[PDB]
Structures are given as structure tokens and as C-alpha cells.
Design a protein around this ligand. Structure first.
Ligand SMILES: O=C(Cn1nc(C(F)(F)F)c2c1CCCC2)Nc1sc2c(c1C(=O)N[C@@H]1CCNC1)CCCC2
Ligand SMILES: N[C@@H](CCC(=O)O)C(=O)O
Ligand SMILES: N[C@@H](CCC(=O)O)C(=O)O
Lengths: 263, 263
């Protein structure tokens, strides 16, 4: 029927969506800033809809429980009808593609290694061949699943270690993973997406580093419930924004214009 | 109805599809080798179909004539019903997305600069600010369209030069562009996709080089006629192959295992 205000699910993840310092001063969409806040505005303008940004209730990206088969996170909010679109750093994966629609990618990324500066690790192979430096991933996301399902020798070796490590090497939020790298004196390395790694690398106190090549190559897509009428126009908008250079401009805005660690 | 032999349109473009040295000895799909030959085999296996590789009649990727509105190339072969699927380095673009279906990307690329080794050019900006070194693109493709439609200062400046340059800076095939770089003594630079640039860089006589960062960021997708039943299973196959590491393995096979210029 007639156009309705679109409910957008997203996640507090820097620099994609961040609470403005004075958010209690503010209301609605104005509380938030970042790459995905800007992207949401652009997509909405190019598709002719009004929208409401909402932070996913459980603070998760989206995973399906093996027993209950229930989806959590942003994927859950789409699947169960709580939100109309997810505009966030949501990784395109096979298991998700089967239950939600994805746009063509608006940003590329790969799994990558974050270290505290001076940590004697250059690669995944290096991590896998030692035990003094612990390492882990975010839970309820595509990185954890990557290791869990990998049949590649090095990554299987890493997963075999991570799943049984004590204390737990897994974290609830990216900020938690970063905090642990920073506070563990080089004895913890964090496996996270290159995009987030490269952002943090240019933030004070300038004490972390991305090392080695990416472990995989993929992208984030804008997600809609399977068969939603929003899917087509949203996909065209992403392609138009890409071709206009708008996506590149926004990356510059939120990553390198935000750089606090020099050149 | 019942499963039918799938007609695959593709293009002779190294290392994606190449005629085996002894092709006149061979018949059908066995005449060809390369990344997209291997990908076609994998996609067909994972989707449960039989197929016939065919080289696009006009040797073009696909562009729409401004007057007649007729599509040429591989895109034309899909649009007019001559082929069931395109498995090739076919760039995902807005204008194409509106007339054909694309899988999620199976390979990333960006527009890039090829020079003869020793050419005093480091960037697009460098090319745009001089006239002694000519430069151009392939015709009937996404790179030419990129420059034609760009509102970005440097690229508009480049397009303004390229469209009126004499003699023509445009070429019919990638091999032609490469031949011209190689034979023009540093007085021609070629604008082509990073994937093709990086392949040629590792081929004898080892006299070309990719310089500067990419001008854009995008990907190739597997294409089907709009609404075709093949689209869904093909897209899942691409994601599965990505997640299994098969796409990375095939890239290594055809780019770096094929490297003739040392380390
Ligand atoms: O192909 C990719 C990344 N990418 N994404 C995927 C997957 F979709 F997640 F499966 C895969 C790859 C590569 C390897 C195979 C699987 N990236 C792609 S394709 C593509 C775009 C962009 C992109 O990042 N977006 C650019 C990056 C900079 N500005 C926006 C933009 C529109 C045209 C098609
Ligand atoms: N982008 C990931 C979350 C981050 C991670 O898993 O490292 C996802 O969509 O699940
Ligand atoms: N991949 C391009 C062809 C190569 C180019 O334009 O540089 C296309 O699909 O049109």
C-alpha cells in the first residue's frame, strides 16, 4: 500500500554508527553519527522513503542458534519482522543470504589480525604455531563462523585452539576485543574485519596495528527481509552511490579524515 | 520444465578464458582454459547443470547504443535470449543491473593504470596534467563508461582529453591496449581493470607495471537474464565457493602460479 516510515536496524560500531557525545540532548535519528548514518540518509533520499534508526536490542550482528534455530541480532530483527532494513557493517554470507536479501556490497573487507604494536606476529600462520599470545574473535558474527567452518589447515588449527582456550578468547563487542589487545601487553591478538582494524589503527592512543594480509575477501551489504519491495531500489541506490563516488567519499570522511595518528 | 544444457556466453580474455595452444585438436568446452573455465565447471557442479561454453560473437563485454538502444556483447546475448548465463570478467554496473541479474561478486577489481616500465607517471592526476604521454581505454566496457559519466574533476579532465585525442586512444581488445603500451616506448599508458593489469605484470616480457592506487572499487558478477531461475542457485554457489576458499585458490592458480617475472 502507501509509503510507510521505514524501520532501520543497525548496530553501535565505530565509525559506522556512534552515539554523538551530546546524544541525551538529541532526539530520533539526530542522536547518531557515522558512515552508516550517512549511508542511510543517502539510500533513503535515492529511494524516496522516510526512516527511523534503531539500535538492535541484543547488540549482535546475527547468528542462528544450533538447537532452537532462532536468529538473533540484526538478522533476527529482519527475519521476525521487527525491522524493514539493516544498514550496518553486516557481512554477506551464504547462511544469511538464504534467509534475507542483500544488496550488492557497499564496502569490501577481509578478516585481519590486530596486534598491540611490537607483538612478534606477522600472520595467521605465526599465531597458529605458538601459544604465548592468545587470540580470538567476536561472538555471534561472520568471523567466528569463518573459523568454525574452515577446512583450511591453518584456520582449522586456529579454531581448534580458540574453541577450547581458557580463559575464553571470545568477546561480546569489538570495543572489548580492542580493550583486551590494548591492556594485555602484547599477549592477546584480535581477529576482526579489516575495515574496523584500519579505523582503530588511526585512533588514539595509536597503539594497535593491522598485520599480514587479509584471511579472506568479502563485503557488507544492505539487508532486507526476503522478497521485500525495498530490495530492488536499495540495490540500485548502492550501485548509483558507488558509481557517483559517494561511497569512497564517505569512507574518507569516517576513516582517514578522522585520523588521529598522523599521516 | 526439464533441465536443459545451459548456454554460457564468455569472452577471450586472459587469464579468464584462453584458447589452449592445441585447440584445433580439441572439441567443445575442452578447447578453453582459464579462471572462468574453472569457475564455470564449479558453478555447474554446485547447481547441477550441464553447459556449453561459447565465445561472444562480437568480442565485446556489453554496451547499449545511444541511438538504437540495442545492447551488444555478452550483455546483449543475455538480453536477446542467445545465452542463458555469462561467466566472464563482467563488471557489475547500474545500467547493466537494470537489464540483467548479477550474482554477488566473485572477484574484486578497480580501474588502474598500466605503464611501460620507466614511464614518468605515478597516478591519474599525473596523466591528467600532461600531454606527451597518450592514454586510453577499451571500448564497449565499464572503464570507458566510468570516464564518460564521471563528474570528478580529474576523471572529467581525462575524459575530455581522451574523447577528442588524435589518433584514437581507444582499443578493441585488452591485448591491443597492452601491445600499444609495449610498442609505444612509454608514450602510451593504458587504463584497465586491476585484475587484468596484475596478470599482465607477471607475464613475459615483464615490461609493464601497474602504478598508483585504483581509481574505483567494484567487482565482477555472474550474469543471467532478468528473472531467470538460474540466478538464485548460481548466487548461492558463488557464496559457497567464496567461503570454501575455492575462488582464492583459482585466483592463485591463474595469476601467481602463472607468474613468469620472478617473485
Ligand atoms: O566484490 C566486492 C567485495 N566482495 N564482496 C563479496 C561478497 F558479496 F560478500 F560475497 C565478495 C567479494 C570479493 C571476493 C568474492 C566475494 N566488492 C564490491 S563489488 C561491487 C562493489 C563493491 C564494493 O566493495 N564497494 C565499493 C568499495 C568502495 N566504494 C564501494 C560496489 C558496486 C559495484 C559492485
Ligand atoms: N561484520 C560481521 C561482524 C564482525 C565480525 O564478525 O568480525 C558480521 O556481520 O557478522
Ligand atoms: N570488465 C569490463 C571490461 C574491461 C574494461 O572496461 O576495462 C566490462 O565488463 O565492461
Amino acid at each position: 500500500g502507501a509509503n510507510k516510515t521505514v524501520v532501520v536496524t543497525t548496530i553501535l560500531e565505530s565509525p559506522y554508527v556512534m552515539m554523538k557525545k551530546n546524544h541525551e540532548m538529541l532526539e530520533g535519528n539526530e542522536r547518531y553519527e557515522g558512515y552508516c548514518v550517512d549511508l542511510a540518509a543517502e539510500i533513503a533520499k535515492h529511494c524516496g522513503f522516510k526512516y527511523k534508526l534503531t539500535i538492535v536490542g541484543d547488540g549482535k550482528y546475527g547468528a542462528r542458534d544450533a538447537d532452537t534455530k532462532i536468529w538473533n541480532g540484526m538478522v533476527g530483527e529482519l527475519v521476525y519482522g521487527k525491522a524493514d532494513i539493516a544498514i550496518a557493517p553486516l557481512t554477506i554470507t551464504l547462511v544469511r543470504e538464504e534467509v534475507i536479501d542483500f544488496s550488492k556490497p557497499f564496502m569490501s573487507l577481509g578478516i585481519s589480525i590486530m596486534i598491540k604494536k611490537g607483538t612478534p606476529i606477522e600472520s595467521a600462520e605465526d599465531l597458529s604455531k605458538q601459544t604465548e599470545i592468545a587470540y580470538g574473535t567476536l561472538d555471534s558474527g561472520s568471523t567466528k563462523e569463518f573459523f568454525r567452518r574452515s577446512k583450511i589447515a591453518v584456520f582449522d588449527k586456529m579454531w581448534t585452539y580458540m574453541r577450547s582456550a581458557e580463559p575464553s578468547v571470545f568477546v561480546r563487542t569489538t570495543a572489548e576485543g580492542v580493550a583486551r589487545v590494548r591492556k594485555s601487553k602484547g599477549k592477546y591478538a584480535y581477529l576482526l574485519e579489516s575495515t574496523m582494524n584500519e579505523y582503530i589503527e588511526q585512533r588514539k592512543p595509536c597503539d594497535t596495528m593491522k598485520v599480514g594480509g587479509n584471511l579472506d575477501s568479502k563485503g557488507y551489504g544492505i539487508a532486507t527481509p526476503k522478497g521485500s519491495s525495498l530490495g530492488t531500489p536499495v540495490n540500485l541506490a548502492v550501485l548509483k552511490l558507488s558509481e557517483q563516488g559517494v561511497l569512497d567519499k564517505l569512507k574518507n570522511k569516517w576513516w582517514y579524515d578522522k585520523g588521529e595518528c598522523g599521516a
